[PDB]
Write an enzyme that holds these catalytic residues in place. Structure first.
Site, PDB file in Angstrom:
ATOM      1  N   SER A   1       1.805  -5.252   9.573  1.00  0.00           N
ATOM      2  CA  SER A   1       1.132  -4.887  10.813  1.00  0.00           C
ATOM      3  C   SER A   1       0.587  -3.465  10.750  1.00  0.00           C
ATOM      4  O   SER A   1      -0.353  -3.118  11.465  1.00  0.00           O
ATOM      5  CB  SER A   1       2.084  -5.034  12.003  1.00  0.00           C
ATOM      6  OG  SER A   1       3.204  -4.175  11.873  1.00  0.00           O
TER       7      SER A   1
ATOM      8  N   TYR B   1      16.293   7.759   2.426  1.00  0.00           N
ATOM      9  CA  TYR B   1      15.098   6.993   2.096  1.00  0.00           C
ATOM     10  C   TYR B   1      15.009   6.749   0.593  1.00  0.00           C
ATOM     11  O   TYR B   1      14.586   5.681   0.153  1.00  0.00           O
ATOM     12  CB  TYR B   1      13.845   7.716   2.596  1.00  0.00           C
ATOM     13  CG  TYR B   1      12.553   6.977   2.329  1.00  0.00           C
ATOM     14  CD1 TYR B   1      12.137   5.943   3.159  1.00  0.00           C
ATOM     15  CD2 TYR B   1      11.746   7.317   1.252  1.00  0.00           C
ATOM     16  CE1 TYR B   1      10.955   5.267   2.921  1.00  0.00           C
ATOM     17  CE2 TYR B   1      10.562   6.647   1.005  1.00  0.00           C
ATOM     18  CZ  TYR B   1      10.172   5.624   1.842  1.00  0.00           C
ATOM     19  OH  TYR B   1       8.994   4.955   1.598  1.00  0.00           O
TER      20      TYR B   1
ATOM     21  N   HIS C   1      -2.086   8.558   2.581  1.00  0.00           N
ATOM     22  CA  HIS C   1      -2.627   9.078   3.832  1.00  0.00           C
ATOM     23  C   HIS C   1      -2.561   8.044   4.952  1.00  0.00           C
ATOM     24  O   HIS C   1      -3.261   7.029   4.915  1.00  0.00           O
ATOM     25  CB  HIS C   1      -4.071   9.542   3.624  1.00  0.00           C
ATOM     26  CG  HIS C   1      -4.602  10.405   4.728  1.00  0.00           C
ATOM     27  ND1 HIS C   1      -5.486   9.939   5.677  1.00  0.00           N
ATOM     28  CD2 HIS C   1      -4.387  11.710   5.022  1.00  0.00           C
ATOM     29  CE1 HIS C   1      -5.788  10.917   6.513  1.00  0.00           C
ATOM     30  NE2 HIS C   1      -5.135  12.002   6.137  1.00  0.00           N
TER      31      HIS C   1
END
Ligand SMILES: NC(=O)c1ccc[n+]([C@@H]2O[C@H](COP(=O)([O-])OP(=O)(O)OC[C@H]3O[C@@H](n4cnc5c(N)ncnc54)[C@H](OP(=O)(O)O)[C@@H]3O)[C@@H](O)[C@H]2O)c1
Ligand SMILES: NC(=O)c1ccc[n+]([C@@H]2O[C@H](COP(=O)([O-])OP(=O)(O)OC[C@H]3O[C@@H](n4cnc5c(N)ncnc54)[C@H](OP(=O)(O)O)[C@@H]3O)[C@@H](O)[C@H]2O)c1
Ligand SMILES: NC(=O)c1ccc[n+]([C@@H]2O[C@H](COP(=O)([O-])OP(=O)(O)OC[C@H]3O[C@@H](n4cnc5c(N)ncnc54)[C@H](OP(=O)(O)O)[C@@H]3O)[C@@H](O)[C@H]2O)c1
Ligand SMILES: NC(=O)c1ccc[n+]([C@@H]2O[C@H](COP(=O)([O-])OP(=O)(O)OC[C@H]3O[C@@H](n4cnc5c(N)ncnc54)[C@H](OP(=O)(O)O)[C@@H]3O)[C@@H](O)[C@H]2O)c1
Lengths: 231, 246, 249, 240
Positions: free
Chosen positions: A11, A148, A182
């Site tokens: 998404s 992470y 980005h």
């Protein structure tokens, strides 16, 4: 043996760029995320015939019933893309266990559940291709991103372990390890050999490549622009 | 379809006379790229071109004079430097470390490592001088990562190729020149037909996919690396081993 | 603190006339190992021996890039000590930095001959000397962190050091069932004469890039080498050990 | 003698590698804390080490057990400036025949458990402007293995975590490293075909617990080594 791909976390970001690119190539995509409103919007601009589903990959049975909906509406899933993940930077000292468990079950355990549910279908058809979206910090590590890094470093050994296990069943599992994408960089983008942050579509092109390469499995494809040489 | 993916590219392929290099030429030309097929064998390069405007070239990449000569022959025939450069030129002189002669070491290093250096250097120079960006692709090996028995010289060269390409990628990044290494496993080529059948059987059992790769599989990754679809991939080693020594 | 870890050990160290090779010779001799210091500059090799139960240490002169010098070196050590060196370390290395577009054929060939071919010749001759005597051993090749990631102005250096890794991995695989271990050391930037050839501000920038925030001393490399040489790492072969301070990890 | 200002916390030091790491560091001058879930087993381990060394009961999966252990750790032995994470479990099985509960189990024990341990060690290692951490991973952790999927995942993240933490705290004189042992003779490799396997392995044998232990001690005593994965497999990684 058609062209139907399941993209978890499709998404937003990389997963969205993956779904967009494979839609142009003629794949039948399924956009899966938690927020169904985001999945519908993603699968809406993806052309036509593409479906959207709601699922928390951190849940054992949520992903189970999501796959039975996949099989029911799209059919056999030939391609799996695990691009669902979360990230909250912070020092290990200033990181409570709740967040530590949270990223682990989403970025690591979540991918293990999805890859497991895609097995019996891909196994019976003796054909399937999986790509788990990781990161460069999953291997080389990065300050303020320990949790992470662990979660993104785990599914590297996992994907490979699964590769040697299922390669005889004509099923390949690979990992895309993007760098800075980005989606602040001034004193950082200058370091990178290509002198810029990457794009989600650039990472997506690598994902599709790994899915279509017949003799590649257990491989970690790095898309960083030379960042790993100086990181 | 990908048959127009490299329509605007001039591709230089060393060792295009056989095996991977030939399959590379096929794939690149199959994507609209005009191939500059180079090889030590004069006829093998021409027959590669025949299977594919295209042109054939002869050069010994291990020699410095023949390397810069090759790039000049290309820029003269096509009035431009090759935007795609693939180094498939390599040989194998296997022998145990204890029993490996100096010549068997010198020759493999010169062809595989030094030969790749000269081509990559001459390619970059031709691209920087004309202010043209590009993609340089060096065909290393999975042996370069873990090593292999009887291939001390081969492993050293291939490992050297990786560090070579990694350095190049970091220096040529400012000039828009991407440099990457391909690390293929065992592939059905004439080079593989050199090693004994009894060993080939063992290797095939070690390979997770349980079969030797096809040269087309290697060209599939070269075509990708040569494309704009990998425009953010540099200094990266791509492995095509079927899971062998992942 | 821990002498007599290498009490019964003859150690051959190439390029022991300076920097890392010198610190290795001191550390090895500090743990009991009789060191055969080899170096292109004999005056530098003799200087190392002067800074150090059976007999004494010996200085050797040899150009490791030459196949004959690599053989004669080993033969001369076996002639001096009546035994092949159980510990062999290749610290003999040079730098000829230049950008890729400007690097000459000589700047390439020279670094390859010394760092890559030189290490090969020393490794080969040392191994042959151990197999023909039924002696176990540990071969330690000093690569670099550059050999894993590459570096600006070091096309020749990175290729050579990366080759050392692929070389050592192969040697370890063949000499495994011959009781000979082979490992590579991958040092970051070290306070040696080689890094004094690096401009001060470049060193400053490098320092602020190293996670530990400083250049390691040659003794840090010697610590790794001493470990790989001893039987404390008896189950370690074909391994690359990084001593970089976290640089390019 | 003098003050024992070199204190090591060996989690999973009841048996196997952790116990060997313990035994070796006990003779090198370090003061130890044998830690495991089974208090009876940990107590027996610290017995042959010495009176200076204490044993503690803890399950690294639970954050509070780790927290309460480090609390009792300091209030009895002093500040902890050395850490060894040898606490881990293994269960061989195909991914399709693996329960989610078994996944969470290994992930919390081998990976999350080693994160909570490093987290609590940060407090004591910052309060002493110096520390050294060794996380025991595996040569399967990065390479993977058929049947050891969950184990590879848990051991895989151990590398990325230790490296990210190494960069994060390197300026505080704290080093974090990973030991990557191959096949070692413990209770974990009890039913493994040492015959059919070792025919490939370069050294032709499995490693003993003390050979891995020496590697752990080495990394703990190597002042210019952080964020590194030391491989102790006898050359297995060249074939795996
Ligand atoms: C890897 O690859 C990803 C690349 O994404 P990006 O950083 O470019 O964009 P991003 O902002 O990380 O997007 C992540 C995507 O994954 C989905 N997602 C997150 N947690 C999930 C869960 N527990 N179950 C199912 N789906 C989940 C999100 O959808 P929802 O949050 O709407 O579910 C979102 O679309 C990274 O997240 C990294 O972890
Ligand atoms: N064949 C494999 O299984 C395999 C596996 C890993 C890597 N590789 C690498 O992939 C590359 C392709 O090899 P291949 O299998 O195609 O071998 P091949 O079928 O024998 O082709 C080698 C070609 O290189 C040319 N060549 C040799 N020496 C040269 C020199 N000094 N100058 C110019 N041209 C020269 C020859 O002419 C020949 O046509 C090789 O560099 C090899 O090292 C091959
Ligand atoms: N110092 C560093 O920053 C660094 C970092 C990573 C790796 N290394 C490697 O570690 C090794 C030690 O270097 P160093 O820092 O000690 O530099 P150094 O102080 O200049 O030592 C080099 C020594 O090698 C000898 N040598 C050079 N060429 C030779 C030849 N052809 N034959 C025989 N001996 C020769 C020289 O005599 C000199 O004493 C080198 O090979 C280097 O590549 C160094
Ligand atoms: N043996 C090998 O071949 C091999 C290979 C690769 C890696 N390793 C690593 O080496 C380490 C130790 O070797 P081993 O496991 O083979 O020896 P082992 O005999 O299995 O010892 C494991 C130790 O970990 C402790 N432990 C287990 N679960 C725990 C938990 N939830 N909380 C706290 N402590 C716990 C155990 O104590 P309790 O009595 O309380 O359970 C035991 O003392 C492991 O962490 C493993 O990851 C071993």
């Amino acid at each position: 043996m058609d062209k139907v791909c399941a993209v978890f976390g499709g998404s937003r970001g990389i997963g969205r760029a993956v779904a967009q690119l494979m839609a142009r190539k003629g794949y039948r995509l399924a956009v899966i995320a938690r927020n169904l409103e985001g999945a519908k919007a993603a699968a809406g601009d993806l052309g036509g015939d593409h479906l959207a589903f709601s699922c928390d990959v951190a849940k054992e049975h949520d992903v189970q019933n999501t796959f039975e909906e996949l099989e029911k509406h799209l059919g056999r899933v030939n391609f799996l893309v695990n691009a669902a993940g979360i990230n909250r930077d912070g020092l290990l000292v200033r990181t409570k266990t709740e967040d530590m468990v949270s990223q682990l079950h989403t970025n690591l355990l979540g991918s293990m559940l999805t890859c497991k549910a895609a097995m019996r279908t891909m196994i019976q058809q003796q054909g399937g291709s999986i790509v788990n979206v990781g990161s460069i910090v999953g291997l080389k590590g990065n300050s303020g991103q320990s949790v992470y890094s662990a979660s993104k470093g785990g599914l590297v050994g996992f994907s490979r372990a699964l590769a040697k296990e299922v390669a005889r069943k004509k099923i390949r599992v690979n990992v895309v390890a993007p760098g800075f994408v980005h989606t602040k960089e001034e004193h950082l983008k200058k370091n990178i050999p290509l002198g810029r942050f990457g794009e989600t579509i650039e990472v997506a092109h690598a994902v599709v490549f790994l899915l279509e390469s017949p003799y590649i499995t257990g491989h970690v494809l790095v898309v960083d622009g030379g960042l790993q040489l100086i990181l | 379809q990908l048959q127009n993916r490299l329509r605007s590219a001039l591709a230089l392929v060393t060792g295009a006379g056989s095996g991977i290099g030939r399959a590379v030429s096929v794939r690149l030309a199959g994507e609209g790229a005009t191939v500059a097929a180079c090889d030590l064998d004069r006829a093998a390069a021409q027959e590669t071109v025949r299977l594919l405007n295209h042109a054939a070239f002869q050069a010994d990449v291990s020699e410095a004079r023949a390397a810069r000569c090759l790039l000049e022959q290309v820029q003269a025939c096509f009035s431009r430097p090759p935007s795609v450069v693939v180094s498939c030129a390599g040989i194998t002189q296997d022998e145990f470390l204890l029993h490996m002669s100096e010549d068997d070491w010198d020759k493999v290093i010169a062809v595989n490592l030094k030969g790749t250096f000269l081509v990559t250097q001459a390619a970059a120079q031709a691209l920087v001088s004309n202010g043209c960006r590009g993609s340089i692709i060096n065909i290393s090996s999975i042996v370069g990562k873990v090593g292999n028995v009887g291939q001390t010289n081969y492993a050293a060269s291939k490992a050297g190729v990786i560090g070579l390409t990694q350095t190049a990628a970091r220096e040529l990044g400012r000039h828009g020149i991407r440099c990457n290494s391909v690390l293929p496993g065992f592939i059905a080529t004439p080079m593989t037909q050199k090693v004994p059948q009894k060993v080939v059987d063992k290797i095939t059992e070690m390979i997770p996919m349980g079969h030797l790769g096809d040269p087309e599989d290697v060209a599939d990754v070269v075509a990708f690396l040569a494309s704009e679809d990998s425009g953010y991939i540099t200094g990266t080693s791509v492995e095509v081993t079927g899971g062998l020594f992942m």
